[PDB]
Design a binder for this molecule. Structure first.
Ligand SMILES: OC[C@H]1O[C@H](O)[C@H](O)[C@@H](O)[C@@H]1O
Ligand SMILES: [Ca+2]
Ligand SMILES: [Cl-]
Length: 870
């Protein structure tokens, strides 16, 4: 009907911004209608002329909203009751358009008092920030399915709606009824919404459970003593991360009771094959498990009686390169138990589908029991937090909450008023005060109420840097005496990708890789990933890299002439070595041309620095993650088809060892260690248990279970089919167990010397040297030396009581190499004791010759040499 866009901005109590011309600016008015009854302006309750502000927009405004800094400014007269107007339908007219209100809403209504439910001895109170709402009431219910028992009116003060009732309100269910103007419908609508500050929910978040999160009955045995029982963490430099999905972990695990597979409770089965696996990794030195999204997300029904399943017996009979398996999975993929969970509804509540019973307390106590179980086998717990976007927006539908209550505020919008979608639809606006508040409050909820040990930030580049830093400070100031957790050990990292509307700091300084340099917050190092694997997950799948045969073992995909592939290989080796040295801006490497270059002076294909950090703790080194192809699958695609699976097994080990022996923080995708496959699925978020299988019997790796789902993969099916059909590509249990044994040993090696985990940039610059460099380097070999104090009157602290020097040779060549390093001649090097005793017969052949400083290393092998002190 009347359905304006919103090209103007109400930025402060007294200023409106609108990009009109000078003559147009001489007659602008503001029109309001409480009933949203305006027509094309007619049908308004009030009008006021806006006098152009020749001074323009002040610094506070242009700093907060850089993308509108050139807009003309208009002064709102003191006669205007702003609090009343922001509840109405508004337009400005010169041309007619609506107003984007977040600036003025923060300016007038930013609030730091209590939100959500507050309990006291004799009362329960509710508080909701909804400054644009015309009315707010609460509907109470006595259970998850009953009818409403009563409706209570809330009263507004300074933008916040509140009501206090008796203690007996505890454990009721409730919803807010919010009467508010929704721009997408140009109407004032009555919306039923859960509490943004919810701490529990009925199934699918249908109602909010008015639970006291501090109730004794929600605490597992010994919960309050957990801080004392937590694994020691001396330094962030000691962190290694293992990235795991909660359903993947136990969906197929026959050692877990059938009715307890797929959720939080599976982690309480201490003797299960899955928990024995995690214990094996932790004992070897793994410190942290990063769990995929585990808060209230859309895309899986919490009501288990609605779950559908493929006939996994029938699908097993289909050919390994058939498209029938994926067709069957896809036919029910919206009704199965499976999703990665990157679809946020309410951040502060555990996912009901992972609980035994989605109504009542089980989701809370079982989440706590999971954290406690992981901690008790020596693993700290990281949550994958998704603050950059929402599942849904608008007035309707069970999965929209924040945007029902304060429409157009929690979500970021373009200059026409339309919601921004670059972060997987319905991008949030952390630049707005109460969004930033909710993000920080949520982090503190998980840290305090669930004793979570760290956080991985999905699309961190879409979050304001100021939000990241305020969160970091608040988290790291938590103490055991005041809060029950040692905040000083809580670690933060994320995806610092810079793209779309947040690029060039257009919405403020965002959490990009470059902007987070010097913050102590980690970001994923895509440079080392791509240099090792080759190309980029969105480039040609056959593009080779340092560890997939570029130059050394061409795969038949044309990638240039021999001189060019040789140089491209050497260029990738430069990028890898910067990454192995913590991916630092200032680390100086002899590059492939012979020229000494800082990490920042070695560039990406887009001219950005390869090395971008100020500290090794800012670097998350990885070759694999839940996104894109698994390590095994990328290797199987890019290497020559003729390689044996035995050869590919060694190549997998090389990749994970480059991570495990790097400076910075190594990150492993669950399954790296056991050759995990998704049958080459590049984006398995909705591909079910069939394509995402984690087999802790080690009988299968899930290679050859059909072409993966067509939506994301069909364009690449022709390269996939002959590989999936070829029996020589599929590993057996022996290979899987061999991969696991060597992964365990390389972790033992990392944790055998503090020299692999240097804590500062200065230490790395002083101690880490690369020895196969320049135009005449031996292709396919990286030699990395790490020095400790030795002799009398040393110029560095002694960090290692067992070893005075470590040298690592990564040999990706399919043949033995002899690397002569005169600088390391006449020293006491011997093969690392772990490798002397390796179950791999080949690595045992590695040798050092003192007279020449010659390190002889077999094909496709990582060899670690130590100089003992005793
Ligand atoms: O698709 C996103 C990709 O775009 C470009 O290829 C960039 O080089 C790469 O860094 C980024 O990941
Ligand atoms: Ca699904
Ligand atoms: Cl077939």
């Amino acid at each position: 009907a009347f359905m304006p866009d919103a090209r103007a901005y109400w930025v402060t109590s007294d200023l409106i911004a609108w990009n009109v011309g000078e003559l147009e600016a001489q007659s602008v008015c503001l029109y309001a209608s409480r009933a949203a009854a305006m027509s094309l302006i007619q049908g308004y309750d009030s009008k006021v002329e806006l006098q152009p502000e020749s001074a323009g927009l002040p610094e506070t405004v242009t700093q907060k909203f850089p993308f509108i800094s050139s807009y003309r400014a208009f002064r709102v007269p003191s006669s205007v009751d702003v609090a009343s107007l922001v509840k109405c339908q508004l337009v400005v007219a010169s041309d007619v358009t609506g107003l984007q209100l977040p600036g003025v809403l923060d300016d007038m209504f930013a609030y730091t008092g209590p939100l959500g439910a507050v309990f006291s001895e004799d009362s329960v109170s509710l508080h909701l920030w909804a400054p644009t709402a015309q009315g707010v009431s609460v509907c109470f219910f006595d259970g998850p399915a009953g009818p409403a028992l009563e409706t209570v009116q809330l009263k507004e003060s300074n933008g916040v709606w509140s009501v206090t009732g008796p203690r007996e309100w505890e454990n009721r269910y409730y919803l807010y009824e919010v009467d508010v103007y929704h721009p997408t419908k140009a109407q004032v609508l009555k919306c039923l919404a859960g509490d943004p500050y919810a701490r529990s929910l009925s199934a699918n978040g249908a109602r909010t459970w008015l639970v006291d999160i501090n109730n004794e009955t929600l605490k597992p045995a010994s919960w309050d003593e957990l801080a004392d029982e937590k694994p020691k963490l001396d330094s962030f430099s000691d962190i290694t991360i293992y990235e795991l999905h909660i359903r993947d972990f136990s969906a197929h695990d026959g050692t877990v009771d059938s009715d307890s597979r797929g959720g939080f409770r599976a982690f309480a089965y201490q003797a299960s094959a899955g928990m024995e696996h995690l214990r094996k990794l932790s004992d070897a030195g793994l410190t942290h498990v990063h769990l995929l999204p585990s808060f209230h997300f859309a895309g899986v029904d919490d009501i288990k009686s609605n779950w559908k399943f493929v006939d996994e017996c029938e699908l097993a009979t289909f050919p390994p390169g058939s498209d029938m398996q994926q067709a069957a999975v896809v036919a029910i993929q919206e009704e199965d138990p499976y999703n990665w969970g990157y679809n946020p509804v309410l951040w502060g509540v555990p996912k009901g589908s992972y609980a035994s019973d989605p109504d009542g307390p089980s989701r809370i106590i079982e989440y706590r029991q999971m954290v406690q179980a992981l901690n008790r086998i020596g693993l700290r717990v990281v949550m994958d937090v998704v603050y950059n976007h929402l599942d849904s927006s608008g007035p309707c539908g069970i999965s929209s909450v924040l945007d029902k209550i304060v429409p157009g505020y929690y979500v970021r919008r373009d200059t026409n008023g339309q919601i921004e979608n670059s972060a997987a639809m319905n991008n949030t606006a952390s630049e707005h005060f109460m969004v930033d508040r909710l993000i920080v409050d949520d982090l503190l909820n998980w840290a305090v109420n669930y004793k979570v040990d760290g956080f991985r930030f999905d699309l961190m580049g879409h979050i304001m840097k100021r939000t990241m830093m305020r969160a970091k400070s608040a988290l790291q100031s938590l103490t055991t005496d005041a809060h029950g957790v040692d905040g000083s050990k809580i670690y933060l990292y994320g995806e610092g990708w810079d793209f779309a509307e947040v690029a060039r700091n257009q919405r403020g300084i965002n959490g990009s890789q470059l902007n987070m340099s010097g913050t102590g917050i980690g970001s994923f190092n895509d440079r080392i990933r791509d240099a090792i694997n080759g190309g980029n997950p969105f480039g040609n799948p056959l593009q080779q890299g340092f560890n997939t045969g570029l130059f050394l073992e061409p795969n038949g995909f044309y990638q240039g002439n021999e001189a060019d592939t040789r140089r491209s290989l050497a260029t990738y080796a430069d990028q890898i070595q910067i990454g192995l040295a913590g991916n630092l801006r200032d680390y100086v490497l002899i590059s492939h041309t012979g020229e000494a270059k800082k990490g920042s002076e070695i560039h990406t294909f887009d001219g950005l620095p390869v090395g971008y950090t100020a500290s090794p703790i800012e670097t998350i080194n990885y070759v694999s993650a839940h996104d894109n192809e698994t390590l095994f699958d990328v290797i199987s695609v890019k290497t020559p088809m003729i390689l044996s699976v035995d050869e590919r097994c060694r190549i997998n080990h090389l990749a994970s060892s480059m991570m495990a022996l790097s400076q910075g923080i190594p990150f492993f995708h669950a399954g790296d260690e056991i050759l995990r496959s998704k049958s080459i699925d590049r984006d398995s978020y909705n591909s079910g248990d069939w394509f995402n299988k984690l087999d802790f019997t080690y009988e299968t790796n899930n290679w050859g279970v059909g072409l993966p789902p067509s939506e994301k993969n069909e364009d690449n099916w022709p390269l996939m089919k002959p590989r999936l059909e070829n029996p020589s590509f599929k590993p057996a249990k022996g290979h899987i167990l061999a991969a696991l044994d060597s992964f365990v040993d390389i972790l033992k090696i990392r944790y055998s010397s503090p020299l692999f985990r240097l804590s500062t940039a200065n230490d790395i610059k002083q101690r880490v040297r690369f020895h196969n460099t320049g135009p005449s380097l031996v292709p396919g070999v990286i030699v990395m030396g790490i020095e400790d104090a030795r002799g009398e009157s040393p110029e560095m602290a002694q960090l290692d009581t067992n070893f005075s020097y470590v040298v690592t040779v990564f040999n990706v060549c399919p043949h033995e190499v002899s690397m002569d390093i005169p600088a390391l001649a006449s020293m006491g090097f011997e093969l690392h004791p772990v490798q002397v005793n390796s179950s791999d017969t080949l690595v045992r052949k590695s040798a050092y010759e003192a007279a020449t400083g010659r390190f002889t290393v077999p094909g496709r092998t990582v060899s670690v040499f130590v100089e003992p002190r005793c």
